[PDB]
């Protein structure tokens, strides 16, 4: 079944854990079924993490340790939004969380429904203020303590939340459904047919006869797949996740190189300048021991190769220490296929000293 990654964000004493305990419990009682929890509805499988800290989350997202498809903002109806609730939504915005579903906790303790109206309107305006659809956002009025207590009236609210997780958060696009992409590792010449490029199909499917573009480093080229093979056996097609060698039409051996990319025509572009969220490892994580400054020019490992680049640090920022999270505008010495969301590693003399994610392509 489709896998979805969700996370809870909210005030420490607003019941994020309680709500999660309630979700797992009720779904199992109903359907029989980084430190995260996992739960299933008749339609999907969920991986649920918590986001107790802003820098921690950003770090984990960057290091791949966690990246949400949807977030559940938990606010207790008793208080309503907290001053830091905007800091919660703002992180959601900052890390591009696609959808935010709200679960008003402790609703069982609020007397006047007109007060519940107030809390919801405050949440809706806060959401809208950071560009989230406050008006369309699903706000479930629940009670995790009561649902957890088997109180059927409130258990239903948990099922209502899961229902929104199923309907509101779009089923993520499977890699096999995305436009073909193969990160080139080794290139071989042959004679008898042509040049073969090896790698692991990242996404999509490459088939004999289909046209592909060689993107990155050099000026883009177009060619036609003359045949796909794995372990020297000519296959029918190359699917996402498989390791293959793609045979190319009219492409010379030296016209392709490691780091370049194969892809469905018109679906990927090479870029040189971008904005990124970066995390620099600490000494204890195997990274740098000392801080770096303005003139640092490491290599950015994109998929299968390094590309040296210079950096631009935020205003006021003049030094980066091991263990720091930092936004930076990178300028590569040559283009490499990329788009917002593309992860990369930062290296020095061949060793990874950090990681990052392409946040906004500039040039």
């Amino acid at each position: 079944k489709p896998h979805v990654n969700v996370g809870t964000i909210g005030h420490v004493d607003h019941g994020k854990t309680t709500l999660t305990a309630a979700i797992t419990t009720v779904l199992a009682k109903t359907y029989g079924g980084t430190s995260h929890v996992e739960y299933d509805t008749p339609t999907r499988h969920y991986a649920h993490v918590d986001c107790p800290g802003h820098a921690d989350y950003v770090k984990n997202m960057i290091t791949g340790a966690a990246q949400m498809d949807g977030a559940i903002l938990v606010v207790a109806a008793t208080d309503g939004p907290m001053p830091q609730t905007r800091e919660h939504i703002l992180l959601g915005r900052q890390v591009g969380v696609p959808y935010i579903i709200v679960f008003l906790n402790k609703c069982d303790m609020v007397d006047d429904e007109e007060l519940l109206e107030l809390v919801e309107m405050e949440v809706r305006e806060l959401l809208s203020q950071y560009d989230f659809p406050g008006d369309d956002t699903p706000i479930v009025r629940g009670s995790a303590l009561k649902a957890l207590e088997g109180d059927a009236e409130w258990e239903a609210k948990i099922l209502e939340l899961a229902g929104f997780l199923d309907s509101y958060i779009p089923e993520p696009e499977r890699a096999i459904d995305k436009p073909f992409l193969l990160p080139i590792e080794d290139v071989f010449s042959i004679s008898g047919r042509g040049t073969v490029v090896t790698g692991r199909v990242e996404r999509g499917i490459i088939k004999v006869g289909e046209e592909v573009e060689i993107v990155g480093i050099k000026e883009t080229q177009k060619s036609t797949c003359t045949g796909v093979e794995m372990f020297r056996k000519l296959l029918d097609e190359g699917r996402a996740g498989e390791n293959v060698g793609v045979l190319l039409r009219g492409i010379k051996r030296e016209e392709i190189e490691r780091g370049q990319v194969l892809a469905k025509p018109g679906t990927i572009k090479p870029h040189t300048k971008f904005e990124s969220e970066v995390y620099i490892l600490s000494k204890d994580e195997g990274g740098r021991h000392t801080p770096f400054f303005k003139g640092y020019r490491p290599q950015f490992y994109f998929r299968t190769t390094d590309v040296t680049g210079t950096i631009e640090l935020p205003e006021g920022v003049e030094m980066v220490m091991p263990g720091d999270n930092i936004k930076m505008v990178v300028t590569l010495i040559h283009p490499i296929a990329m788009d917002d969301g593309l992860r990369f590693a930062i290296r020095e003399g061949g060793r990874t000293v950090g990681a990052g994610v392409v946040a906004k392509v500039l040039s």
């Binding site: 420490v12 419990t25 109806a77 208080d79 001053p83 800091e87 007060l115 107030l118 000392t290 400054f293």
Partner: protein, 282 residues
């Protein structure tokens, strides 16, 4: 007066307190907003007392200079989302200004002065907030460096410009020296450390005469590692901070480095386990 949702909103959008805390206070104040604000003061101290036992290891370090007097301060909260909060910033900044204005180095006095406000803030933020520590640095030329809200540094120098002082404050932030010059380390501690080193060398099987001569050599780096001028300038490791100063005819008179959470637990939580611990019966 009748307590209506409209009235509760009036007090909430004026206080920032919980919806229900407003409702209860207004009802008992019988619609009197000003009285309800006063009621909440009383009940607020009790809410802050409740949160008072929670570990506040997060927060910010603030620094402000005023001529020949500088102040560095640490104000804690539970999460960074709150440390990044404007209200929290506003609180810490106000505590900082007052400390510079009145030259307040006794954290008890500072705490006493801001107790009411701290309780009000805690009552609307719902996290333990605490004015942890404060210190003053005095000197001829004063400089500071904030590495995010996390690390704050104050530096006193002589014959050093804003840029040099700033760079030194950047070095102190990174390299954490504890003495200014190698000669500042007392013969008592140098000797004590000598013994520690000697003991480790001896047990290593090394013959006495060799172990002693080896420890002897390690003592020189010991004092150079713990002192500002003996450490390698972060911006240029090929030179010590003392060389950088000499070539500038500058001198460092003092420095203070604070880092959020220093000396506090750093608990660590297990979400999954906590969820499971709650998944009891039904």
């Amino acid at each position: 007066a009748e307590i209506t949702a409209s009235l509760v909103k009036e007090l909430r959008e004026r206080t920032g307190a919980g919806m229900m805390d407003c409702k209860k206070a207004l009802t008992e104040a019988n619609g009197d907003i000003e009285l309800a604000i006063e009621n909440m003061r009383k009940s607020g101290a009790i809410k802050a007392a409740k949160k008072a036992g929670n570990v506040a290891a997060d927060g910010v370090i603030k620094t402000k200079i005023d001529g020949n007097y500088g102040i560095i301060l640490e104000v804690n909260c539970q999460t960074d989302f709150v440390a990044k909060d404007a209200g929290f910033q506003a609180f810490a900044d106000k505590v900082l200004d007052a400390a510079v204005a009145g030259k307040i180095t006794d954290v008890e006095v500072l705490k006493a002065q801001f107790e009411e406000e701290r309780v009000a803030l805690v009552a609307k933020i719902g996290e333990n907030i605490n004015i942890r520590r404060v210190a003053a640095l005095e000197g001829d030329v004063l400089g500071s460096y904030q590495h995010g809200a996390r690390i704050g540094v104050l530096v006193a120098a002589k014959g050093a410009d804003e840029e040099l002082v700033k760079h030194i404050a950047m070095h102190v932030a990174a390299s954490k020296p504890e003495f200014i010059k190698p000669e500042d380390v007392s013969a008592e501690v140098v000797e004590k450390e000598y013994q520690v080193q000697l003991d480790i060398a001896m047990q290593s099987g090394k013959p006495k005469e060799i172990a002693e001569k080896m420890v002897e050599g390690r003592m020189k780096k010991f004092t150079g590692e713990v002192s500002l001028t003996g450490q390698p300038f972060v911006m240029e490791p090929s030179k010590t901070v003392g060389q950088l100063l000499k070539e500038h005819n500058a001198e460092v008179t003092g420095f203070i480095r604070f880092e959020v959470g220093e000396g506090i637990e750093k608990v660590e939580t297990d979400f999954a386990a906590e969820v499971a611990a709650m998944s009891k019966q039904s």
